[PDB]
Amino acid sequence: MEYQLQQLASLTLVGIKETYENGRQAQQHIAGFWQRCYQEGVIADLQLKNNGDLAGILGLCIPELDGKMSYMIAVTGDNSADIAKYDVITLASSKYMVFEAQGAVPKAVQQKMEEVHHYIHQYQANTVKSAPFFELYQDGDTTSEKYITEIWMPVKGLEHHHHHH
Numbered sequence: 001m002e003y004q005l006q007q008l009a010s011l012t013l014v015g016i017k018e019t020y021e022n023g024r025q026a027q028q029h030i031a032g033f034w035q036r037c038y039q040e041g042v043i044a045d046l047q048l049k050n051n052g053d054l055a056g057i058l059g060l061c062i063p064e065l066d067g068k069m070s071y072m073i074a075v076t077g078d079n080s081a082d083i084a085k086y087d088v089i090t091l092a093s094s095k096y097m098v099f100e101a102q103g104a105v106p107k108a109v110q111q112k113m114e115e116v117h118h119y120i121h122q123y124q125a126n127t128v129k130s131a132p133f134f135e136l137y138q139d140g141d142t143t144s145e146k147y148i149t150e151i152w153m154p155v156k157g158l159e160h161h162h163h164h165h
């Protein structure tokens with residue numbers, strides 16, 4: 001599997017986080033969540049705020065300590081008075097394995113997520129289960145077979161994996 005190693009400083013993310021019981025069939029809920037954010041003008045409003053620290057819209061999967069799973073639609077923004085309407089989180093600095101899913105959204109993303117899932121199974125000491133992972137949707141036609149979604153998986157100590165020696 002191909003991936004790029006990337007590192008991010010700590011960032012401020014502005015958007016809306018919803019919380020789902022399962023994290024399993026949440027895929028249907030996540031679909032509805034995207035649809036609602038588009039319909040209610042939230043995507044458009046967040047786009048205005050995107051400072052380009054990351055060049056697109058994020059779909060973050062956030063683990064909850066009670067076992068629930070949250071999904072946050074967000075952009076990187078300047079920490080400046082958006083708490084009144086939006087959720088604002090700090091995304092703690094981390095290294096990442098960054099994968100590319102090429103094809104029409106969401107199917108290409110789902111298929112790649114499955115492959116990533118199977119792949120990182122061999123890196124249990126290096127992935128970070130408590131840290132958010134995310135989809136990154138940069139500018140483009142998400143219905144195009146050429147469209148690329150990035151999948152960002154946080155890692156620690158990856159250099160020590162015996163695969164790299």
Ligand SMILES: CCNc1cc2oc3c/c(=[NH+]\CC)c(C)cc-3c(-c3ccccc3C(=O)OCC)c2cc1C
Binds near residue numbers: 028057109138142
């Ligand atoms: C700039 C990013 N723009 C978009 C990003 C999106 O990410 C999605 C992630 C998903 N899960 C995690 C992979 C699921 C299930 C649906 C998604 C849709 C989606 C949700 C509801 C209905 C249709 C779509 C959809 O994909 O319509 C075709 C584009 C989606 C749509 C747009 C428009």
Ligand SMILES: c1ccc([P+](c2ccccc2)(c2ccccc2)c2ccccc2)cc1
Binds near residue numbers: 129154
């Ligand atoms: C609990 C919650 C999330 C993960 P995981 C993961 C998958 C495969 C092997 C190890 C870990 C994940 C990844 C993609 C989709 C669903 C779950 C995961 C979480 C954070 C960082 C790396 C991997 C694991 C346990």
